[PDB]
């Protein structure tokens, strides 16, 4: 039945990055888009694009990574080190603009839904709106 399509997507990306895939797909959905769109615009992913598995709308999400490392375990540093859903289905989180979180002292982002649209933490303050704190990413 799949509980939270969002947490899923976020997770799909986390599970994929760790193994360094080039792109994991995800079941398509308008609201899901924005998350990517922003997530990409800020520089967390090379990009995304609609696709189709055996007659099912999905989304390719081309992952970004750091350069190779020297020494034991040439594991390439991540571009997404951290990603986590805040407002869950079993606990909706809502914040006023006068109280929106600063992810990793500004290094990080905090995407969130709002009456004006899905916006970054900063863009939230920009247009001065609060909303459902979706998740943060750094």
């Amino acid at each position: 039945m799949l509980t939270d399509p969002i947490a899923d997507m976020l997770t799909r990306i986390r599970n994929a990055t760790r193994v360094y895939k080039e792109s994991t797909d995800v079941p398509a959905s308008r609201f899901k888009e924005e998350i990517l769109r922003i997530l990409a615009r800020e520089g967390f992913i090379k990009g995304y694009e609609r696709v189709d598995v055996d007659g099912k709308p999905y989304l390719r999400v081309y992952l970004k990574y750091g350069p190779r490392r020297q020494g034991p375990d040439p594991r390439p540093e991540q571009v997404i080190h951290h990603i986590r859903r805040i407002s869950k289905p079993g606990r909706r989180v809502y914040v006023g603009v006068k109280e929106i979180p600063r992810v990793r002292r500004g290094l990080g982002i905090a995407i969130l839904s709002t009456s004006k649209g899905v916006l970054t933490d900063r863009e939230a303050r920009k247009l001065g709106v609060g909303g459902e704190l979706i998740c943060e990413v750094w």
């Binding site: 800020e42 520089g43 090379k46 970004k64 540093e77 571009v79 990793r104 002292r105 290094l107």
Partner: protein, 151 residues
């Protein structure tokens, strides 16, 4: 050549017919009070030899640390299996406020303002290892945009 400071020198032991002999733990930190830091844990049947040995390992394993006017860039939490440690940025005049271990680290790190706490376990050794990693995961604004670029 840098600075030198040991966190502890414990005497471990081991059984063997007719009695017990002992090696000697010795954890030491070393740094220029200016970004370069390295931790070391030496062992040997002699206290001096042990600290001496920790000295060699210290300068071996090292780590540059992005210092913003004596503080750390962003806050980070790092769990070394057992224990866990928090690290927070603070304005000048805050001082290094932490357990004796992470102090040695951050002090010989050249850090001078920082909020911190040891949650979870607290074994000096593991908290040591933990902090090193934590700093080793600090990232300057550049590092960020530099990775988040990929031009």
């Amino acid at each position: 050549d840098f600075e030198e400071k040991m966190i502890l020198i414990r005497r471990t032991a081991r059984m063997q017919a007719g009695g017990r002999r002992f090696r000697f733990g010795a954890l030491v930190v070393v740094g220029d009070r200016q970004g370069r830091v390295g931790l070391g844990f030496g062992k040997a049947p002699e206290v001096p030899l042990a600290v001496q040995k920790a000295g060699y390992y210290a300068r071996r394993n090292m780590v540059e640390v992005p210092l913003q006017n004596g503080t750390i860039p962003h806050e980070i939490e790092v769990e070394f299996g057992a224990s866990k440690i928090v690290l927070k940025p603070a304005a000048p005049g805050t001082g290094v406020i932490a357990g004796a271990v992470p102090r040695a680290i951050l002090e010989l790190a050249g850090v001078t303002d920082i909020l911190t706490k040891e949650l979870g376990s607290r074994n000096p050794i593991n908290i040591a290892y933990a902090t090193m990693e934590a700093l080793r995961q600090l990232r300057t604004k550049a590092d960020v945009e530099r990775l988040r670029k990929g031009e």
